[PDB]
Amino acid sequence: SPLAAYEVDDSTGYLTSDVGGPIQDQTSLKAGIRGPTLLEDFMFRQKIQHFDHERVPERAVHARGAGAHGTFTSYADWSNITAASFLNATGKQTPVFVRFSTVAGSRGSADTARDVHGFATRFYTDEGNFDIVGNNIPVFFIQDAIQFPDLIHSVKPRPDNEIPQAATAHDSAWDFFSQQPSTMHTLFWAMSGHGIPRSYRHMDGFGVHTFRFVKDDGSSKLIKWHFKSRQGKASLVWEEAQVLSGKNADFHRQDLWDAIESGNGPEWDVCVQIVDESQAQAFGFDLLDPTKIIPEEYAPLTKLGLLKLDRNPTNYFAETEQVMFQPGHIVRGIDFTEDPLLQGRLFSYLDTQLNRNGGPNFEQLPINMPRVPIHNNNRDGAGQMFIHRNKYPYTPNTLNSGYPRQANQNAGRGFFTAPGRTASGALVREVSPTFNDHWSQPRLFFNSLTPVEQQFLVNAMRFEISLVKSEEVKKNVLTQLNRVSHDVAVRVAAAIGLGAPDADDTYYHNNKTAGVSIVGSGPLPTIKTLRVGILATTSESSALDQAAQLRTRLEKDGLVVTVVAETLREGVDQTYSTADATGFDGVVVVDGAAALFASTASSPLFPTGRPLQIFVDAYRWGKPVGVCGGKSSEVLDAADVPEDGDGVYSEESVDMFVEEFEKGLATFRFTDRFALDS
Amino acid sequence: SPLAAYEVDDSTGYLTSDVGGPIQDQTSLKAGIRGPTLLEDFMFRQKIQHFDHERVPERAVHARGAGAHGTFTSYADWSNITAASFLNATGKQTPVFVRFSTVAGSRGSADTARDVHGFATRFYTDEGNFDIVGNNIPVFFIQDAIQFPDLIHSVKPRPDNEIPQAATAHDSAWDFFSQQPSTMHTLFWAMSGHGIPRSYRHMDGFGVHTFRFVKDDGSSKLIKWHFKSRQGKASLVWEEAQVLSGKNADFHRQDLWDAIESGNGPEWDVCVQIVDESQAQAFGFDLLDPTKIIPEEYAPLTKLGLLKLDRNPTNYFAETEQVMFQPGHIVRGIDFTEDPLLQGRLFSYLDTQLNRNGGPNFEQLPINMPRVPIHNNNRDGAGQMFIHRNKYPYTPNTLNSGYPRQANQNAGRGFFTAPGRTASGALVREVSPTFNDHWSQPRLFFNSLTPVEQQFLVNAMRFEISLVKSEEVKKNVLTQLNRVSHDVAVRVAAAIGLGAPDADDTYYHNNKTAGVSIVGSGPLPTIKTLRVGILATTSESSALDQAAQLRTRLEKDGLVVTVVAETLREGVDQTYSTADATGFDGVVVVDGAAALFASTASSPLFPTGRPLQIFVDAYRWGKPVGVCGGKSSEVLDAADVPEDGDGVYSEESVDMFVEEFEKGLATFRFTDRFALDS
Amino acid sequence: SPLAAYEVDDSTGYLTSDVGGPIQDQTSLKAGIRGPTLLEDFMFRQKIQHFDHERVPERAVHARGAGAHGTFTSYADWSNITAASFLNATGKQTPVFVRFSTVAGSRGSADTARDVHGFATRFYTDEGNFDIVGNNIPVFFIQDAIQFPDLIHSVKPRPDNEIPQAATAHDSAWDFFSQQPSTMHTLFWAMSGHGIPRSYRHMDGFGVHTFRFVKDDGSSKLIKWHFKSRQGKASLVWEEAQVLSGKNADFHRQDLWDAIESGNGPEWDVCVQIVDESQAQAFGFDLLDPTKIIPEEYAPLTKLGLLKLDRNPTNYFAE
Ligand code: HDD
Ligand code: HDD
Ligand code: HDD
Ligand SMILES: [Ca+2]
Ligand SMILES: [Ca+2]
Ligand SMILES: [Ca+2]
Ligand SMILES: [Ca+2]
């Protein structure tokens, strides 16, 4: 913790200026008790000036996000495939910092927007900082970095009025998607449940690009990075995400914070797919193309180590806001590929930190510093924090005895470009013909989802495209969807009253791939941290008694339990007024409370119908719901919830109720409650 | 070093990026050996981006300057006059940093321009950083801060062509001086020897403004700060300064550096004049007026302690360039007065550091940090280096137990405004009538100079005004000068071919004041560090033996000896090609070298006449010169220098030569060699 | 020109703020005639804030310099060798701006330091701005851009004391030159009279690098840019340059200003050496190597047009 050396404690002591002079900061200096404020009030000005300059530009993308500290532990000595020092011994531990994010919204936008999500991991290795700046979706919208402002301008708010915030549901985005068909693969992922994850802990991370692992002998293999969640994969449903955006814009950052504080810090297996250089085009697409995945059937995952997040930042601004990641932060044993999206990224991340930091010495901020000595001839610049002793900062020199020395493949453990890499041909601004198949892999992805997942994706597209005003853009969108799947274009067209174009089967096929479905990936492996809302009443002393007994039983198994009542008191966490179904992964009514759910309910302490609305919403959104007490039928009738439904629980016995209700939590969503196209 | 904790050592090790990855930095990554450079070359881009951003804006004024670390030691417990902690005990020591500067020139301009000089001192006290931002002249050009950009625009280069650099010798400067008569006092100081000091070590420092000392009981006294040089006062002559500006633009910074490295670190007595609040108008002028001195006859200096500079910086940029002084850096026991120049300065220095530093956390740069803990609720901002633990940074609070506490007169040793201070009357943009005598003190100053000093001042005015093209500006200048002294206006007028206006005696008097004269302040109190050039030859093994014997005898008394000859070899420091009279305080020819001084002397190794020119220039500029060995008449006749002249030495004996010559160095300048008007 | 539309005239009128409100700027607002200055004095603070923020970072190299406006006139239709629009017809005129400079000194350093000199020309062409950022010496010290901070750190002042200003006469410079032998060619030029020119008008300019002329059909030829002074070539002597540095630090900018004002605006012939792609290695060195000239005996100069500088800037900072 270079973070702990820079920590500042203010738990005792008298207020000082920034130069250590004790002062006051509550009243301005004035000429007389009702007089004007004086220019000589240095206390006033130092304080306001600091306030007035507190903000810094938000990131150009991924502005909305949150971070945590942890550790990476290697499972083996990986010398045989990479020279990377953080992977060179069983059990070797490296500190990490991770930031998760959306792409499109500004700071302050809602966590539960539909979007691609960032998953950026810094490894503070003993041979330098290494960053993997990935996303929760393994493919990207575009095939060349020069198009990135085009993609981003199209998805961000229309620039006359700056509407809409954090959403692709507008003409410009679908105009771009429909004119730039490379977008189809990422679009399909973003329109699935991968666009609205349950939490940062319930998504995967991917490096997206093919990279190289380079051995000390100089041989190389091609790799893709996969961070596979140990919490399982899980999504919201859209109608739930929308309400969550309003009720709790901070949902994902709160979830992450709380999991870490409770001792449930999330984990991922850090994995690679590893293939030979000769396989760059063996799989029916080009490994230089970031719109393509390698099916796991062609290349299995190898598990390199464990990533665990287990500590929250001390100061959000200083750590999370100021962390400045770069794919250029590379270490010996890793190399780039000629992926034209990766290639341009290298430029952008060094440049953009000048905007954020306002000066060139951004690598000296505590969160950006390495954990090894720095020896170089970089000097001066605004905000220079070091006092360099070497007064001959040039190479070659004799007056500093030739130091710092050059590092390279054979000296000082230098980074070196993989020596088998070559280039040949004309200097061109031309797209490789090997990149031209934009529709096959979207179809592979779509084929690999379950029927209800396919319906959710169609429904997401129906939602967004129905909000596009241009009839031409809508037609063009159907044209592109039709090339992936005639069925998708037909079902989407039905919602927007246009006809789909005739089937064009060039890229149609029936193939599937493992591991891309959320709903298909079986029950969650753990239910720790999941949220249960127990709906109770201060009316009946039996209701708070039953709530307390359920609480014990659920908290035993690591669930986070919230007892809801009309008013706060001992045992009650939340009022009906502040409660919502978006707040819980499952809801239980204690039978003691059945009168609150009648249609003539009414209280000055919460909005009309709130108790029942929580229960109904939770049911309609596919959550496990139940009534505990043995007079269940009255609440279930008021809800129009069938007692015999999957994921509906009714028991008098607390112990039997809990046992089945917990199986429901693992199932997580009951997908039989959602209507499917015929 | 106080700043040891921020030092970075590069005396060993391999080159790394700023994030600790070992790299190389000598060849670009290319596609083929004769190929184009690749964008993925992160080694290139990080290195060049840093270089591309090395520069920061130069200070708006005082851009050209140099600094050093040292110590202040109090002579006493000054409780009786101030609560200031750094003055509260005999022998109490406080680290300091001082920067000296010119005013008008940009950061690569010559040290030996004619100008006002800056003398800015930071005291890193145990109750906060205290800065005295002074000049080497005790009065300022203007009476209101709002006029500062007018003054500075007028003296800086003309904004169409940015000519001339670091000089007042142009129409705009003299236009402003003639139209704004407040300028007269400082103008006379600037045109005296005080405009072209021999070194930073041979000038005084002044706070200029009246300030207040405040006791812990709340009573106050008015003070002026005086830093009185223990090295004595000394000036260049103009014709010398001009040549030095070209031969060694770094003259003052080099002199300071060298004095420190040789163990001759310069010293000042830190003094105050102290008077009662009741005396603010008792001396015939207003103590709020920064164009006035308090004659020493009315208020003597109290010596408070010793300022010694004895350590050079390690990195100029990080220390000297980045030091950000403010008169707002004040400590308990000191307060401001209603001097309208001081009042506006308090705003400027906080604001201008945003420009220099490019962000609001400039007090976190090592040179600017205090040497005591910081406890405040200032947060965020670009370049934030701290990780603040207190997550409730507001007052008033209970969630951080009311910390940090408010400090004031009665708790926590807070700063407090002197409680006797009041204000009365209309809110006005009007000048006090008490400020209106612009001419009496300029006349007091002029009257207090010796006849030769008066001549030099006149000659500085004749030089500068003769370069003003506008006949009307020149007439306007003589109108103002004439109000100070009819004689001055007459003598100046004679050079520029105008008639002086008739005498106007309203502000004429015959009064004098002690201690403002340089010439009249007797011989220097020490000659340590003064420079002696010995002009020798490799022709004659005799000449180099004489030079070696002289050198040993002069070095024993701490003079810096340079032996000069046609070519370097053992015992010879400099060639005639690189030598100039501007490089010496005294010049000695060894008589074995007499042949070099003939008119038909000529060599491919130095410009024609160079040896003799050094001697002649030294004589004409008032320096002690001599011939050592017994045979003096050929050199002295070649140079047209009378053997019986004051400050001309001829002896055979090295011991007798040096005993006489050292008296000459202490005299420093022989003023009988300069012609007087009339 | 675009320069005229942005010009602001202050030869009449009352003082205003930046937002057009008439104001005064000579006395601070105070609580009584001998009182403290008020925070509500917006006239004071807008003025001093602007002053406080006047400066910008100097250029990392070529900080010390001066500029003038002028015209370039093509001598012919150069279609046969380049598609460049500004060279596509006899008599075609294109506005230019040129800045001349030293390399090593800060703002405020003397014009007559010994140094390589900058000669940077912007052509505001009808198909976009085209800059030739050249020097008065045709070859450069180093063969790879990555080394540029090394060269510059070595020649700039020693970083503990920032001594010496605008000068290669110190250990670090000569350490670098002696350890990096690519430097020798430029070093010889800088140690000649080319290091201390008499004026900006009495030096030539060079693009240094080999560039390509490309025709509309896509064929290319290798070129070197030479701007050849019509005023002739002239130098100071060193002992004169040293005194001049002290007596008149603005010597070259004054000389340029004065020549233009007197109707003696300086001229250059803008020239190229033009060789085939196949001759990249034909002359006993590599045309990709910026430490090498092509001897005029092997490739003669072709005169493309006339560069004339004939108007001084209105505002130095802004232009
Ligand atoms: C050419 C530009 C460009 C391209 C093609 C990309 N990005 Fe990027 N990305 C940026 C330019 C950029 C940026 C503007 O440079 C950002 C904003 C702030 C920053 O540090 O970098 C950024 C931020 C950024 C962040 C946030 C890092 C953090 O939490 O601070 C993530 C996770 C990604 N990007 C991930 C990706 C992935 C997985 C991409 C494709 C595979 C991708 N970006 C393509
Ligand atoms: C209203 C503006 C204003 C006024 C009236 C003054 N100054 Fe000032 N001064 C500045 C505005 C300023 C500044 C723009 O704020 C500078 C530039 C850099 C900095 O830190 O402050 C500055 C710098 C500065 C420095 C350089 C400090 C260093 O070495 O970094 C000195 C020594 C002084 N000044 C001294 C004075 C004296 C003795 C004054 C009158 C008694 C004076 N200044 C009036
Ligand atoms: C990799 C960095 C690098 C390299 C190898 C060079 N320069 Fe450069 N040059 C810069 C980096 C730079 C810079 C840091 O980018 C400057 C500073 C100000 C600016 O606009 O660019 C610059 C300024 C600059 C200027 C001043 C322009 C003006 O008047 O505003 C000239 C004339 C040159 N350079 C000319 C050259 C020549 C003829 C070079 C070799 C043939 C050369 N430079 C190599
Ligand atoms: Ca739109
Ligand atoms: Ca900025
Ligand atoms: Ca002028
Ligand atoms: Ca050096």
Author numbering:
A (entry chain B), B (entry chain C): 21 to 698
C (entry chain A): 21 to 339
From the paper:
The mediation of the 3TR–CATPO interaction by water molecules in the plane of the inhibitor suggests a flexible binding site with the possibility of accommodating a variety of planar ligands of different sizes, suggesting that this could also be the site of phenolic substrate binding. The residues Pro158, His246, Gln293, Ile313, Ile314, Glu316, Leu321 and Val536 surround the 3TR binding pocket and are structurally homologous to the residues that bind NADPH in the mammalian catalases. However, the 3TR binding site for reversible inhibition has not been identified to date, although its noncompetitive nature would be consistent with a non-heme-centred mode of action. We therefore wondered whether this reversible inhibition could in fact be mediated via the oxidase substrate-binding site that we have identified. In this case, we would predict that catechol binding would protect the CATPO catalase activity against 3TR inhibition. We therefore carried out a competition assay at a constant concentration of 3TR (40 mM) that is sufficient to nearly totally inhibit the catalase activity and increasing amounts of catechol, and observed that the presence of catechol reduces 3TR inhibition in a dose-dependent manner. Interestingly, catechol itself inhibits the catalase activity, but in a much less potent fashion than 3TR. This suggests that, as proposed by others, the reversible inhibition by 3TR is mediated via an allosteric effect and that other molecules binding to this pocket will also have an inhibitory action. In this context it is interesting to note that the 3TR complex also shows a reduction in the number of ordered water molecules in the main channel when compared with the apo wild-type structure. In summary, based on our structural, mutation and kinetic data we propose that the pocket at the entrance to the lateral channel, occupied by the nicotinamide moiety of NADPH in mammalian catalases, is the site of both oxidase substrate and 3TR binding.
